[PDB]
Design an enzyme around this catalytic site. Sequence first.
Site, PDB file in Angstrom:
ATOM      1  CG  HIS A   1      12.235  -1.647  12.784  1.00 54.57           C
ATOM      2  ND1 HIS A   1      13.060   0.020  12.402  1.00 54.57           N
ATOM      3  CD2 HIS A   1      12.174  -1.398  11.398  1.00 54.57           C
ATOM      4  CE1 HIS A   1      13.341  -0.075  10.877  1.00 54.57           C
ATOM      5  NE2 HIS A   1      12.070  -1.311  10.616  1.00 54.57           N
TER       6      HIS A   1
ATOM      7  CG  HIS B   1      10.745  -7.191   8.516  1.00 59.52           C
ATOM      8  ND1 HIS B   1      10.047  -7.324   6.997  1.00 59.52           N
ATOM      9  CD2 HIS B   1       9.947  -7.183   9.304  1.00 59.52           C
ATOM     10  CE1 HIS B   1       8.955  -6.811   6.976  1.00 59.52           C
ATOM     11  NE2 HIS B   1       8.144  -7.079   8.656  1.00 59.52           N
TER      12      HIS B   1
ATOM     13  CG  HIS C   1       6.156  -7.565  12.988  1.00 59.67           C
ATOM     14  ND1 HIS C   1       6.736  -6.865  13.414  1.00 59.67           N
ATOM     15  CD2 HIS C   1       6.574  -8.117  11.182  1.00 59.67           C
ATOM     16  CE1 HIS C   1       6.685  -6.159  11.538  1.00 59.67           C
ATOM     17  NE2 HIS C   1       6.794  -6.951  11.189  1.00 59.67           N
TER      18      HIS C   1
ATOM     19  CD  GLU D   1       3.116  -6.007  12.530  1.00 57.62           C
ATOM     20  OE1 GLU D   1       3.323  -6.003  11.816  1.00 57.62           O
ATOM     21  OE2 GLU D   1       3.585  -5.077  13.486  1.00 57.62           O
TER      22      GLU D   1
ATOM     23  CG  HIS E   1       5.308  -9.461   7.416  1.00 58.89           C
ATOM     24  ND1 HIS E   1       5.527  -7.986   8.418  1.00 58.89           N
ATOM     25  CD2 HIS E   1       3.899 -10.121   7.641  1.00 58.89           C
ATOM     26  CE1 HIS E   1       4.481  -8.047   9.124  1.00 58.89           C
ATOM     27  NE2 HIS E   1       3.827  -9.773   8.747  1.00 58.89           N
TER      28      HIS E   1
ATOM     29  CB  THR F   1       2.492  -3.464  10.106  1.00 61.90           C
ATOM     30  OG1 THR F   1       3.675  -4.618  10.337  1.00 61.90           O
ATOM     31  CG2 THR F   1       1.160  -4.709   9.394  1.00 61.90           C
ATOM     32  CB  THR F   2       6.825  -0.415  10.560  1.00 57.85           C
ATOM     33  OG1 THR F   2       7.753  -0.703   9.564  1.00 57.85           O
ATOM     34  CG2 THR F   2       7.500  -1.509  11.339  1.00 57.85           C
TER      35      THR F   2
HETATM   36  O1  LIG Z   1       7.894   6.374  -0.777  1.00 55.87           O
HETATM   37  C1  LIG Z   1       9.326   5.804  -0.298  1.00 55.87           C
HETATM   38  C2  LIG Z   1       9.974   5.503   0.788  1.00 55.87           C
HETATM   39  C3  LIG Z   1       9.010   5.040   1.788  1.00 55.87           C
HETATM   40  C4  LIG Z   1      10.235   3.862   2.973  1.00 55.87           C
HETATM   41  C5  LIG Z   1      10.994   4.144   3.062  1.00 55.87           C
HETATM   42  C6  LIG Z   1      11.868   3.418   4.174  1.00 55.87           C
HETATM   43  C7  LIG Z   1      10.602   2.528   4.211  1.00 55.87           C
HETATM   44  C8  LIG Z   1      10.201   1.915   4.191  1.00 55.87           C
HETATM   45  C9  LIG Z   1       9.518   3.404   3.229  1.00 55.87           C
HETATM   46  O2  LIG Z   1       9.148   1.259   4.079  1.00 55.87           O
HETATM   47  C10 LIG Z   1       9.551   0.163   5.765  1.00 55.87           C
HETATM   48  C11 LIG Z   1       9.007  -1.251   5.653  1.00 55.87           C
HETATM   49  C12 LIG Z   1       8.743  -1.928   4.740  1.00 55.87           C
HETATM   50  C13 LIG Z   1       8.270  -3.412   4.682  1.00 55.87           C
HETATM   51  C14 LIG Z   1       7.532  -3.568   5.870  1.00 55.87           C
HETATM   52  O3  LIG Z   1       6.747  -4.672   6.021  1.00 55.87           O
HETATM   53  C15 LIG Z   1       6.914  -2.012   6.617  1.00 55.87           C
HETATM   54  O4  LIG Z   1       6.127  -2.657   7.958  1.00 55.87           O
HETATM   55  C16 LIG Z   1       7.414  -1.084   6.429  1.00 55.87           C
HETATM   56  C17 LIG Z   1      10.344   0.891   6.195  1.00 55.87           C
HETATM   57  C18 LIG Z   1      11.387  -0.963   6.408  1.00 55.87           C
HETATM   58  O5  LIG Z   1      12.620  -1.789   5.706  1.00 55.87           O
HETATM   59  O6  LIG Z   1      11.090  -1.373   7.653  1.00 55.87           O
HETATM   60  O7  LIG Z   1      11.978   1.076   5.498  1.00 55.87           O
HETATM   61  O8  LIG Z   1      10.581   7.171  -1.178  1.00 55.87           O
HETATM   62  C19 LIG Z   1       9.891   7.878  -2.032  1.00 55.87           C
HETATM   63  C20 LIG Z   1      11.388   7.915  -2.714  1.00 55.87           C
HETATM   64  C21 LIG Z   1      11.910   7.027  -3.737  1.00 55.87           C
HETATM   65  C22 LIG Z   1      12.412   6.480  -2.774  1.00 55.87           C
HETATM   66  C23 LIG Z   1      13.826   5.235  -3.626  1.00 55.87           C
HETATM   67  C24 LIG Z   1      12.992   5.206  -5.096  1.00 55.87           C
HETATM   68  O9  LIG Z   1      13.759   4.699  -5.465  1.00 55.87           O
HETATM   69  C25 LIG Z   1      12.430   5.476  -5.847  1.00 55.87           C
HETATM   70  O10 LIG Z   1      12.097   5.183  -6.863  1.00 55.87           O
HETATM   71  C26 LIG Z   1      11.434   6.974  -4.876  1.00 55.87           C
HETATM   72  C27 LIG Z   1       9.486   8.186  -2.090  1.00 55.87           C
HETATM   73  O11 LIG Z   1       9.684   9.279  -0.561  1.00 55.87           O
HETATM   74  O12 LIG Z   1       8.360   9.179  -2.899  1.00 55.87           O
HETATM   75 ZN   LIG Z   2       6.528  -6.499   8.786  1.00 57.00          ZN
END
Ligand SMILES: O=C(/C=C/c1ccc2c(c1)O[C@@H](c1ccc(O)c(O)c1)[C@@H](C(=O)O)O2)O[C@H](Cc1ccc(O)c(O)c1)C(=O)O
Ligand SMILES: [Zn+2]
Length: 257
Positions: A61, A91, A93, A103, A116, A195-196
């Site tokens: 992405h 990262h 956009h 965004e 961001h 935002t994703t």
């Molecule tokens: O909530 C989460 C994980 C959510 C998540 C996973 C991957 C992501 C994410 C959120 O954010 C996204 C993201 C990041 C930045 C942005 O600006 C954006 O817009 C989106 C995405 C990315 O990098 O694009 O990756 O895990 C815990 C578990 C859980 C897992 C791992 C642990 O260590 C923990 O203590 C608990 C749960 O499921 O309750």
């Molecule tokens: Zn972003």
Amino acid sequence: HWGYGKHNGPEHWHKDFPIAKGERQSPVDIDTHTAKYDPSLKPLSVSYDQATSLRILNNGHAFNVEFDDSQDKAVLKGGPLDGTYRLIQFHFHWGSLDGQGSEHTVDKKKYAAELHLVHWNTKYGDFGKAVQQPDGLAVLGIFLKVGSAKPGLQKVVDVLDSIKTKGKSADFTNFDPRGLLPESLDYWTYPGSLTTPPLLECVTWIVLKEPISVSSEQVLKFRKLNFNGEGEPEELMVDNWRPAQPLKNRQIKASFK
Ligand SMILES: O=C(/C=C/c1ccc2c(c1)O[C@@H](c1ccc(O)c(O)c1)[C@@H](C(=O)O)O2)O[C@H](Cc1ccc(O)c(O)c1)C(=O)O
Ligand SMILES: [Zn+2]
């Protein structure tokens, strides 16, 4: 299988991620005349001198520059924030054209790109726990306009060839994110979301008023990245932005004037 295409783009995300239609989604349009100056925000503190970058990843992405977040090394505090927030990754956009890519918008103006810098609240122990909390993340957003080159961006630009396609990573040590910051830290702030997907409503947004300038050549290199994996049909990684979402019951606060 969400993405930024016609059949899987932002208007589709709600089917897999119903919070896409939630009460505090991001990005938003920043109406500069309606934002209100809040003389109480405390000074905003960006402390990146000990930042330890590790790796750069094309995740299909965007690309993420990842940091060692296992100690307080690169932290954001102050401003609207209670406590300390650790830098995990940054990262961007960006658009297919200089006339779009950001965004957030400012009085409906779209910038060519948006940076961001993602930080998590240390009271929650790690990023995955933090994202499940309404004050789990603080994202510093910085607009990019096309003009003069940003010298501090060039190291990023130059590594992109090595991470052209989804799932590729490369070592990316000793990168100094201070080289991506504008002169002024004046900002707008509001409560929002990722935002994703998964679009979680865990972000305090801090959007800087002053854009940074990058050169046409620098943004052109961003647009040579691929959404696809190696050995798949080439789909340029462009227009990886979500449009502005309804403000709903929120107020945007200004740190200035
Ligand atoms: O909530 C989460 C994980 C959510 C998540 C996973 C991957 C992501 C994410 C959120 O954010 C996204 C993201 C990041 C930045 C942005 O600006 C954006 O817009 C989106 C995405 C990315 O990098 O694009 O990756 O895990 C815990 C578990 C859980 C897992 C791992 C642990 O260590 C923990 O203590 C608990 C749960 O499921 O309750
Ligand atoms: Zn972003």
